[PDB]
Amino acid sequence: MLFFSFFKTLVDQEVVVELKNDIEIKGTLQSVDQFLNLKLDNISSTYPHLGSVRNIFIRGSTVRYVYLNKNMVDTNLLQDATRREVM
Protein backbone atom coordinates (compact mmCIF):
# COMPACT_ATOMS: atom_id res chain seq x y z
CA MET A 1 0.00 0.00 0.00
CA LEU A 2 3.12 2.21 0.17
CA PHE A 3 2.69 3.49 -3.40
CA PHE A 4 -1.05 4.09 -2.90
CA SER A 5 -0.03 6.50 -0.12
CA PHE A 6 2.65 8.00 -2.36
CA PHE A 7 0.25 8.53 -5.23
CA LYS A 8 -2.28 10.03 -2.81
CA THR A 9 0.46 12.58 -2.11
CA LEU A 10 0.36 13.93 -5.69
CA VAL A 11 -3.36 14.64 -5.97
CA ASP A 12 -4.05 17.97 -7.71
CA GLN A 13 -0.60 17.67 -9.25
CA GLU A 14 0.32 17.65 -12.92
CA VAL A 15 1.74 14.26 -14.07
CA VAL A 16 2.91 12.58 -17.28
CA VAL A 17 1.65 9.03 -17.75
CA GLU A 18 3.39 6.72 -20.21
CA LEU A 19 1.30 3.72 -21.24
CA LYS A 20 2.71 0.27 -21.99
CA ASN A 21 1.24 0.97 -25.42
CA ASP A 22 3.56 3.93 -25.98
CA ILE A 23 0.76 6.43 -25.38
CA GLU A 24 1.79 9.43 -23.32
CA ILE A 25 -0.77 11.51 -21.40
CA LYS A 26 -0.21 14.70 -19.36
CA GLY A 27 -2.96 15.77 -16.98
CA THR A 28 -3.86 16.53 -13.37
CA LEU A 29 -3.92 13.62 -10.93
CA GLN A 30 -7.43 13.70 -9.53
CA SER A 31 -7.61 10.29 -7.97
CA VAL A 32 -5.89 6.94 -7.28
CA ASP A 33 -7.08 3.58 -6.04
CA GLN A 34 -5.63 0.36 -4.63
CA PHE A 35 -4.72 -1.21 -7.98
CA LEU A 36 -2.98 2.09 -8.72
CA ASN A 37 -5.60 3.07 -11.28
CA LEU A 38 -5.39 6.78 -12.01
CA LYS A 39 -8.10 9.34 -12.68
CA LEU A 40 -6.74 12.39 -14.50
CA ASP A 41 -8.36 15.72 -15.18
CA ASN A 42 -7.47 18.28 -17.82
CA ILE A 43 -5.48 15.92 -19.98
CA SER A 44 -3.16 16.98 -22.81
CA SER A 45 -0.56 15.76 -25.27
CA THR A 46 3.07 15.83 -24.19
CA TYR A 47 -0.24 10.83 -27.73
CA PRO A 48 -3.27 9.19 -29.44
CA HIS A 49 -5.91 10.85 -31.59
CA LEU A 50 -8.86 11.60 -29.30
CA GLY A 51 -11.80 13.96 -29.70
CA SER A 52 -12.90 16.19 -26.87
CA VAL A 53 -12.10 14.55 -23.50
CA ARG A 54 -11.35 16.23 -20.15
CA ASN A 55 -11.34 13.44 -17.60
CA ILE A 56 -9.89 9.95 -18.02
CA PHE A 57 -9.39 6.79 -16.02
CA ILE A 58 -6.27 4.78 -16.55
CA ARG A 59 -5.84 1.17 -15.56
CA GLY A 60 -2.82 0.71 -13.33
CA SER A 61 -1.60 -2.52 -14.85
CA THR A 62 -1.25 -0.81 -18.25
CA VAL A 63 1.16 1.99 -17.17
CA ARG A 64 4.94 1.84 -17.68
CA TYR A 65 6.01 5.17 -16.15
CA VAL A 66 4.60 8.15 -14.33
CA TYR A 67 6.77 11.19 -14.81
CA LEU A 68 7.00 13.57 -11.88
CA ASN A 69 8.92 16.60 -10.75
CA LYS A 70 11.47 16.45 -7.93
CA ASN A 71 9.57 19.32 -6.24
CA MET A 72 6.62 16.97 -5.74
CA VAL A 73 8.39 14.53 -3.45
CA ASP A 74 10.25 14.51 -0.15
CA THR A 75 12.69 11.77 -1.09
CA ASN A 76 13.74 11.41 2.57
CA LEU A 77 10.27 10.33 3.59
CA LEU A 78 10.06 8.03 0.55
CA GLN A 79 13.24 6.26 1.58
CA ASP A 80 12.43 5.98 5.27
CA ALA A 81 8.91 4.80 4.43
CA THR A 82 10.48 2.23 2.05
CA ARG A 83 12.74 1.15 4.85
CA ARG A 84 9.65 0.48 7.02
CA GLU A 85 7.71 -1.71 4.56
CA VAL A 86 7.81 -5.47 5.10
CA MET A 87 8.66 -7.92 2.32
Binding site: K8, V11, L19, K20, N21, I23, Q30, S31, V32, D33, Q34, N37, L38, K39, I43, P48, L50, G51, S52, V53, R54, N55, I56, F57, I58, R59, S61, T62
Partner: protein
Protein backbone atom coordinates in the same frame (compact mmCIF):
# COMPACT_ATOMS: atom_id res chain seq x y z
CA UNK B 1 -9.76 8.05 -0.98
CA UNK B 2 -10.60 5.86 -4.03
CA UNK B 3 -11.17 6.27 -7.78
CA UNK B 4 -14.63 5.31 -9.13
CA UNK B 5 -15.67 5.22 -12.79
CA UNK B 6 -19.07 6.40 -11.43
CA UNK B 7 -18.81 9.90 -12.89
CA UNK B 8 -18.87 8.30 -16.35
CA UNK B 9 -22.05 6.27 -15.75
CA UNK B 10 -24.82 6.31 -18.40
CA UNK B 11 -22.70 8.66 -20.56
CA UNK B 12 -20.76 8.39 -23.83
CA UNK B 13 -17.12 7.32 -23.43
CA UNK B 14 -13.96 6.49 -25.37
CA UNK B 15 -12.15 3.26 -24.62
CA UNK B 16 -8.57 2.66 -25.61
CA UNK B 17 -7.62 -1.00 -25.61
CA UNK B 18 -4.19 -2.46 -24.84
CA UNK B 19 -3.77 -3.45 -28.51
CA UNK B 20 -4.09 0.29 -29.07
CA UNK B 21 -7.49 0.07 -30.70
CA UNK B 22 -10.23 2.65 -30.15
CA UNK B 23 -13.90 2.32 -29.27
CA UNK B 24 -16.83 4.60 -28.58
CA UNK B 25 -19.74 3.57 -26.42
CA UNK B 26 -21.97 4.32 -23.47
CA UNK B 27 -20.97 3.16 -20.04
CA UNK B 28 -23.88 1.42 -18.30
CA UNK B 29 -22.06 -0.67 -15.73
CA UNK B 30 -18.67 -1.54 -14.33
CA UNK B 31 -16.99 -3.58 -11.61
CA UNK B 32 -13.82 -3.40 -9.49
CA UNK B 33 -11.70 -5.18 -12.14
CA UNK B 34 -13.07 -2.57 -14.57
CA UNK B 35 -14.96 -5.03 -16.69
CA UNK B 36 -17.42 -2.78 -18.48
CA UNK B 37 -20.98 -2.95 -19.72
CA UNK B 38 -21.16 -0.84 -22.86
CA UNK B 39 -23.94 0.19 -25.21
CA UNK B 40 -23.81 1.23 -28.86
CA UNK B 41 -20.18 0.22 -29.41
CA UNK B 42 -18.43 1.69 -32.45
CA UNK B 43 -14.91 1.24 -33.78
CA UNK B 44 -13.18 4.51 -34.65
CA UNK B 45 -10.53 3.48 -37.19
CA UNK B 46 -13.45 2.42 -39.44
CA UNK B 47 -16.41 4.14 -37.73
CA UNK B 48 -17.96 0.67 -38.11
CA UNK B 49 -20.80 -0.46 -35.84
CA UNK B 50 -19.78 -3.20 -33.41
CA UNK B 51 -22.54 -3.92 -30.90
CA UNK B 52 -25.84 -2.74 -29.45
CA UNK B 53 -24.77 -4.14 -26.13
CA UNK B 54 -21.48 -5.70 -25.19
CA UNK B 55 -19.48 -6.82 -22.21
CA UNK B 56 -15.85 -5.73 -22.26
CA UNK B 57 -13.23 -7.35 -20.04
CA UNK B 58 -11.01 -5.19 -17.85
CA UNK B 59 -7.75 -6.86 -18.96
CA UNK B 60 -8.20 -5.38 -22.43
CA UNK B 61 -8.73 -1.89 -21.23
CA UNK B 62 -5.97 0.67 -21.03
CA UNK B 63 -8.08 3.69 -20.74
CA UNK B 64 -11.51 5.30 -20.52
CA UNK B 65 -12.22 8.98 -21.38
CA UNK B 66 -15.47 10.92 -21.00
CA UNK B 67 -17.06 12.52 -24.08
Amino acid sequence: MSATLKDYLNKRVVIILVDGESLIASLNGFDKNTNLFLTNVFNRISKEFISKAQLLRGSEIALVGLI
